[PDB]
Amino acid sequence: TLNGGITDMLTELANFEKNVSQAIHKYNAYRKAASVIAKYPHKIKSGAEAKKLPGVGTKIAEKIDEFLATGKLRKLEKIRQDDTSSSINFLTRVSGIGPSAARKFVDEGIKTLEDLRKNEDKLNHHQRIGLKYFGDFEKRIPREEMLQMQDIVLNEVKKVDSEYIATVCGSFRRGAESSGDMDVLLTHPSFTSESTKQPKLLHQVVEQLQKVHFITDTLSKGETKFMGVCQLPSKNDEKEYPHRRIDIRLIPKDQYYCGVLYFTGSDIFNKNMRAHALEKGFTINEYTIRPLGVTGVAGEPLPVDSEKDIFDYIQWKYREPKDRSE
DNA sequence: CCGACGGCGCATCAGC
DNA sequence: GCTGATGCGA
DNA sequence: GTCGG
Numbered sequence A: 001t002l003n004g005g006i007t008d009m010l011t012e013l014a015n016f017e018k019n020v021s022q023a024i025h026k027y028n029a030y031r032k033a034a035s036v037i038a039k040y041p042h043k044i045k046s047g048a049e050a051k052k053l054p055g056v057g058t059k060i061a062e063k064i065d066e067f068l069a070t071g072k073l074r075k076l077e078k079i080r081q082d083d084t085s086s087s088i089n090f091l092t093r094v095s096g097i098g099p100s101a102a103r104k105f106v107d108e109g110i111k112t113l114e115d116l117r118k119n120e121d122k123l124n125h126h127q128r129i130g131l132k133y134f135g136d137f138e139k140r141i142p143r144e145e146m147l148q149m150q151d152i153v154l155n156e157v158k159k160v161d162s163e164y165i166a167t168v169c170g171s172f173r174r175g176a177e178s179s180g181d182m183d184v185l186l187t188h189p190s191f192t193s194e195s196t197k198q199p200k201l202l203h204q205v206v207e208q209l210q211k212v213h214f215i216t217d218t219l220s221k222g223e224t225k226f227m228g229v230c231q232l233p234s235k236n237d238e239k240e241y242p243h244r245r246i247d248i249r250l251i252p253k254d255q256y257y258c259g260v261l262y263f264t265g266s267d268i269f270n271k272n273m274r275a276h277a278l279e280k281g282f283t284i285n286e287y288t289i290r291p292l293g294v295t296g297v298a299g300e301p302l303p304v305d306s307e308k309d310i311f312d313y314i315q316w317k318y319r320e321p322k323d324r325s326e
Numbered sequence B: 001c002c003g004a005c006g007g008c009g010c011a012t013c014a015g016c
Numbered sequence C: 001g002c003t004g005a006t007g008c009g010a
Numbered sequence D: 001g002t003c004g005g
């Protein structure tokens, strides 16, 4: 909140470039600048001072000076008035509707929540669910509720097979007071980078959670990733809790550390760390950290026994989860 | 100046 | 049916 | 839009 005005402006500019301009790199550039400014420990006084931060160039510097002076950004004033842009922006807020589909719908005259509801037939499954719980998905999740959800998931997973280990990551693991959703990393000894000694490992868990009515809907479901909806049980006379998005990722047990690092985030932190890895001659994904030969092709997986091991390979001091919220 | 910018899972599609 | 490309998402 | 070579 120290430089809230400027970061909000940058984030809005970022969303515009992504949803309307479909210029993903401009999107990341803005988000990075927004992130770097967000942790700057001083109340920014000028674009010049801001340009000293990495990721902030001449363009954002000018925009910051404009914002600091007037208290707004004309470029944004306009974007906010353009009915097409605003419509595209809105629709992309429905889970399942990206920049392409949004532009396509608007070109069909479908540009509001009301239009989407009467044209439900024109939506694929994911979009149908995103629209159904549109309101709820906008709501944040108090950490207290996250704790209750964790308890339900861990206990139900334990019931399926005591050998399962379920770890809630995402912003929760980073210590956030509230989260946009629940992200669950799941492991089981019967599934490693060496073999899949038992099939349906993820299925069984998803099934158990549906059986006790915690999981209510499914957006997508594969062998290692589940994307759906859940809801905490409410007491008698108590109004129901909002429905929530839940992601579950089954990762090879022998690759837990690269897995938990990836799933802990943040997303911008992962980008920056993976970008730093490249500059150091390494490539990192949710399974391994591999070296890059002179040729450029990824080499063999390096031995990892802790999140810190990954940080060492790239010559970075270890950072606790609470300090990776970029 | 200009090429890189993180990496991948699932759903859906076109082309065979 | 397969692969590969795309959209959308983590 | 920003960066580094």
Ligand SMILES: Nc1ccn([C@H]2C[C@H](O)[C@@H](COP(=O)(O)C(F)(F)P(=O)(O)OP(=O)(O)O)O2)c(=O)n1
Binding pocket: A169, A170, A171, A172, A178, A179, A180, A181, A182, A183, A247, A262, A263, A264, A265, A266, A267, A270, C010
């Ligand atoms: N583009 C991305 C997106 C995600 N992630 C990893 C790193 C992320 O931490 C993790 C979770 O994705 P999430 O989509 O639940 C998230 F990011 F919003 P979270 O941090 O959990 O914040 P919230 O509370 O609001 O959910 O996936 C990533 O690596 N790249």
Ligand SMILES: [Cl-]
Binding pocket: A022, A023, A024, A025, A026, A027
């Ligand atoms: Cl771009």
Ligand SMILES: [Cl-]
Binding pocket: A009, A071, A072, A073, A074, A076, A077
């Ligand atoms: Cl503004």
Ligand SMILES: [Cl-]
Binding pocket: A254, A255, A256, A257, A258, A259, A287, A288, A304, A305
């Ligand atoms: Cl690992």
Ligand SMILES: [Cl-]
Binding pocket: A285, A287, A288
């Ligand atoms: Cl790999």
Ligand SMILES: [Mg+2]
Binding pocket: A170, A171, A179, A180, A181, A182, A183
């Ligand atoms: Mg999350």
Ligand SMILES: [Mg+2]
Binding pocket: A170, A181, A182, A183, A246, A247, C010
């Ligand atoms: Mg998530």
Ligand code: NA
Binding pocket: A050, A051, A052, A053, A054, A055, A056, A057
């Ligand atoms: Na800079």
Ligand code: NA
Binding pocket: A091, A092, A093, A094, A095, A096, A097, A098
């Ligand atoms: Na969307």
